[PDB]
Amino acid sequence: EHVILLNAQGVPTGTLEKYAAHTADTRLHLAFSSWLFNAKGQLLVTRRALSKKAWPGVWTNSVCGHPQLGESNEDAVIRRCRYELGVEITPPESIYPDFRYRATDPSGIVENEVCPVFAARTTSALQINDDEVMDYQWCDLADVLHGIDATPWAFSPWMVMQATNREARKRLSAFTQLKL
């Protein structure tokens, strides 16, 4: 598994093995983040497993990951939803295409990413992958946003950064409608 390296502007220059790529000195690379809603409009929040190299044991949005060579961002969303959560989804919608961020985790690991954000609906039951996700909750988006506003430090920084972007937040809101 690898990551797609990017330079100063957002242009690909090559690839790099994924573990080896996430260190105290992580270079810029391509990622995605997704927010998943069930038919009832509840948001899936997940807790990263304790074995993740970066932000292990941390509460965050539904799924994130790293597109591979030849993969579109949307296929990467679909693949990681299957891998981490075993779940089928509707075509992922682009809700924050220019999100980019750099952050250091509690033990020193850095994520440095160009990270377009998506939202989708789940169309199957979950089969959680315990190597990736250690806990989860189906919640009202309103509640999640109130908690992020009261105690943002309790959640991953990327989750918080995406949730307070005005435009992304309106799209999350639209996914809370009940759909049969």
Ligand X SMILES: C[C@@](O)(CBr)CCOP(=O)(O)OP(=O)(O)O
Candidate list 22, 35, 62, 65; residue touching Mg ion; CB under 5 A: 65
- Residues in contact with ligand X, counted by CB under 6 A, come to a total of 11
Residue 105 contacts which entry, Mg ion, ligand X, Mn ion, none (Cβ below 5-8 A, type-dependent): none
* Residue positions forming the annotated binding site for substrate: 18, 48, 52, 66, 80, 84
Measured distance CA(49)–CA(81) in Å, rounded: 15
At closest approach, how far in Å is the CB of 3 from Mn ion? 6
Question: Per-residue DSSP letters for 27-56?
Answer: PPEE-EEEEEE-TT--EEEEEE-TT-SSST
Q: Kindly state the helix (H) or strand (E) to which residue 15 belongs, with its residue range.
A: strand 12-17
103 forms bridges with which residues in the sheet? 111
Pick between residue 28 and residue 141 the one whose CB is nearest to ligand X: 28
Residue 59 contacts which entry, Mn ion, ligand X, a copy of itself, none (Cβ below 5-8 A, type-dependent): a copy of itself
- Go through 119-151 and write b for each residue having 16 or more CB atoms within 10 A of its CB, e for each that does not: bbbbeeebebeeebbbeeeeeebeebbeebeee
Of residues 85-144, those binding Mn ion (CB under 5 A): 111
List the catalytic residues. Answer: 64, 113
Pick between residue 53 and residue 169 the one whose CB is nearest to ligand X: 53
**Binding residues for ligand X, per CB under 6 A?**
31, 33, 54, 64-66, 80, 111, 113, 115, 158
